[PDB]
Amino acid sequence: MSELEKAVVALIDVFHQYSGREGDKHKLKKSELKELINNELSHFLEEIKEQEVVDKVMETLDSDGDGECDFQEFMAFVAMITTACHEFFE
Amino acid sequence: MSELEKAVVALIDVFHQYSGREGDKHKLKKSELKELINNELSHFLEEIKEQEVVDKVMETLDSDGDGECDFQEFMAFVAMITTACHEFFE
Numbered sequence: 001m002s003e004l005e006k007a008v009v010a011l012i013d014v015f016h017q018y019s020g021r022e023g024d025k026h027k028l029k030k031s032e033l034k035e036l037i038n039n040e041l042s043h044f045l046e047e048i049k050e051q052e053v054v055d056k057v058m059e060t061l062d063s064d065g066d067g068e069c070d071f072q073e074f075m076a077f078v079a080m081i082t083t084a085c086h087e088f089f090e
Numbered sequence: 091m092s093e094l095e096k097a098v099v100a101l102i103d104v105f106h107q108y109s110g111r112e113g114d115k116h117k118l119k120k121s122e123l124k125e126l127i128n129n130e131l132s133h134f135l136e137e138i139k140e141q142e143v144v145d146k147v148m149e150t151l152d153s154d155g156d157g158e159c160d161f162q163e164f165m166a167f168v169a170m171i172t173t174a175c176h177e178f179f180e
């Protein structure tokens with residue numbers, strides 16, 4: 001696989017690693033999302049230690065309002081992080 | 091870096107590898123986009139060999155209509171490929 005193909009598969013893998021922990025195995029609840037950010041973006045994003053931050057993140061990502069982050073909403077999250085990563089050095 | 095962090099950086103890297111070849115170094119023209127797909131998604135996507143397919147792909151991705159694919163539009167492309175990759179086995 002190319003680096004791009006590996007990256008695509010890595011996005012799928014990390015989503016399911018976390019979404020499969022509790023409840024709907026195909027969506028991230030608040031706790032799953034929090035651990036995803038804290039464990040897997042520890043170099044990019046500040047560790048989340050406040051409920052209010054967890055709440056605000058979910059509220060931002062939860063486009064359809066069902067209180068969870070589904071795959072499509074996670075793709076939008078990845079675009080946000082990647083864009084922020086890309087804009088950091090400008 | 092985590093796998094997710096590596097993936098984020100890989101998206102940035104592949105975009106610039108191709109966008110930096112000709113013209114605006116921060117956007118993909120048709121030829122840059124074609125080679126990106128043919129070289130870096132050879133296992134996922136059919137190789138593009140027809141002008142009409144290259145045209146249709148750019149038309150689909152070029153949300154703002156400037157005839158090129160910028161970083162934001164590339165993020166949407168990545169979401170499309172990843173979603174298609176994710177839905178393939180269902």
Ligand SMILES: CN1CCc2cccc3c2[C@@H]1Cc1ccc(O)c(O)c1-3
Nearest residue numbers: 085086087088089090099102103106
């Ligand atoms: C390892 N790289 C080599 C090639 C390259 C070429 C332009 C830009 C970047 C990179 C990267 C990583 C990178 C990370 C964060 C950013 O904000 C960036 O703008 C870039």
Ligand SMILES: CN1CCc2cccc3c2[C@@H]1Cc1ccc(O)c(O)c1-3
Nearest residue numbers: 009012013016175176177178179180
């Ligand atoms: C290596 N993997 C291990 C874990 C895992 C768990 C669910 C789903 C997938 C994966 C992947 C790759 C994968 C690739 C394409 C898909 O359409 C998928 O649904 C998955």
Ligand SMILES: [Ca+2]
Nearest residue numbers: 019022024027
């Ligand atoms: Ca879940």
Ligand SMILES: [Ca+2]
Nearest residue numbers: 020021022025
């Ligand atoms: Ca389990």
Ligand SMILES: [Ca+2]
Nearest residue numbers: 062066068069
């Ligand atoms: Ca949702």
Ligand SMILES: [Ca+2]
Nearest residue numbers: 109112114117
């Ligand atoms: Ca270019």
Ligand SMILES: [Ca+2]
Nearest residue numbers: 110111112115
């Ligand atoms: Ca050059």
Ligand SMILES: [Ca+2]
Nearest residue numbers: 152156158159
């Ligand atoms: Ca454009």
